[PDB]
Chains A and B, each alone.
Chain A
């Protein structure tokens, strides 16, 4: 029933964010953002809590050379919340997820933004810190 309350997007296609789970992956190369209609010459961009298609560039060879769904956990871009506070996380992070929203890993390193925690209950279940 809750909304999304769109925020600033600072992770376009081609951004490489570090993975924050114990799967074994080190980086997540974003190749596209789910739910983007698109505009001419406009690169799709992803905020925190958005499903993306990502590829592992370095890490376990099993995860490499294929496409994995992912959800952004943190971003360095400062985004405005409805209470008027601008927040950023000093690093861009994400976790490998499946189509239905169940995380592939079992633990999350670092805090998780409250938008992603509210939007994805499975991620918030394993989240150590919120916002």
Chain B
């Protein structure tokens, strides 16, 4: 018989292989479509979730009650030190798919990149790419590399570049760099190949590809939560207190005549650590990392045109469970998937951005730097010392 009262189902059937993610680094399933009219550029980057803070900004939406009004919005900080290009990969179209054609690496590979090639770096002899680099310093090897580049230019239609992060500049415990293919979109195949070859063994800052007030995509893995019940995994209704054999369950698993439980029935299992791809994340501010000309330059992280202070994005005592942000960082509106120290993949929008919200210009007015390790109440140590005055430990 039909159910007495209709109700929408719990959860989405389009998201339910609910398995612990096989990969840790976020994966770009589909790069932006390539058109041979715009200049060459990258479409992906790797960052690390540092923390979250406030923002103050005037709204510029006519007709809204919030027009020309200051608002407080949550923003997340993603530290993005520059990446190093180490190789390129070519692809050829096939009626079966798109298989890789040829991969060429650079003569010099950093130890951080070589960390990824070994499961046990301590026990390893660090022999990776020992014979490969002999090609770059020999006439026969140079001729072979020239032939490889010519073949990729003649046959390949999709070109991707291998780049790795600089884990030395991060405060994280791990030292193994993250290596990812980044697709180069731009002019013809030859132009993209030559541009990628020029960028070999070179650092690519994040500001080259991403700009201010731009909608991007964030790709990463969700926070892991282990084995969870159906009440928490699928947000089903709880049975009343009188229930004998447990109330944090689903009462009717299925019907009789189909003598199986369908795949659409909510059940207990792994919750969290799922690969996700969010869309329409707006870049409020692209920050400049610590640099030294005479002394330290820390103002640019958290100084605005209205504050003009020497603050940094790091709160008092630093970011909780992450550390201190020293390199370049990207400020995204709202929240992103993953926990602290989680590597996040920044991807360009796959859609044309023509909207009032998408084209809105962002002008920061104030950045909150109060300590997140408790109920902070002072922006800087100087303000705290001025308010409190001298203490016993002086």
B72 and A1 within 8 A (CB): no
Residues of B within 8 A of A84 (CB): 54, 71-72
A40 and B5 within 8 A (CB): yes
B64 and A83 within 8 A (CB): no
B65 and A83 within 8 A (CB): no
Give 4 new A-B contacts, CB below 8 A, not counting A3-B64, A5-B65, A39-B7.
Answer: A5-B66, A83-B71, A84-B54, A84-B71
- Minimum distance in angstroms from B194 CB to a CB of chain A: 50
B72 and A83 within 8 A (CB): yes
Residues of B within 8 A of A82 (CB): 66, 69, 71
* Chain A residue with Cβ nearest B54: A84
Residues of B within 8 A of A3 (CB): 64-65
A40 to B70 alpha-carbon distance, docked (Å): 38
Residues of B within 8 A of A83 (CB): 69-72
- Minimum distance in angstroms from B345 CB to a CB of chain A: 30
B237 and A41 within 8 A (CB): yes
- Minimum distance in angstroms from B266 CB to a CB of chain A: 16
The dominant DSSP class at the B interface is loop
Closest 9 CB pairs of A and B: A84-B72, A40-B7, A2-B65, A82-B66, A82-B71, A1-B63, A3-B65, A40-B5, A83-B71
Query: 0/1 per residue, B130-160, Cβ < 8 Å to A?
Result: 0000000000000000000000000000000
A123 to B5 alpha-carbon distance, docked (Å): 39
**Sample (23) of A-B pairs whose CB atoms are under 8 Å apart:** A1-B63, A2-B64, A2-B65, A3-B64, A3-B65, A5-B65, A5-B66, A39-B7, A40-B5, A40-B6, A40-B7, A41-B237, A82-B66, A82-B69, A82-B71, A83-B69, A83-B70, A83-B71, A83-B72, A84-B54, A84-B71, A84-B72, A118-B65
CB interface residues, B 1-40, toward A, < 8 Å = 5-7
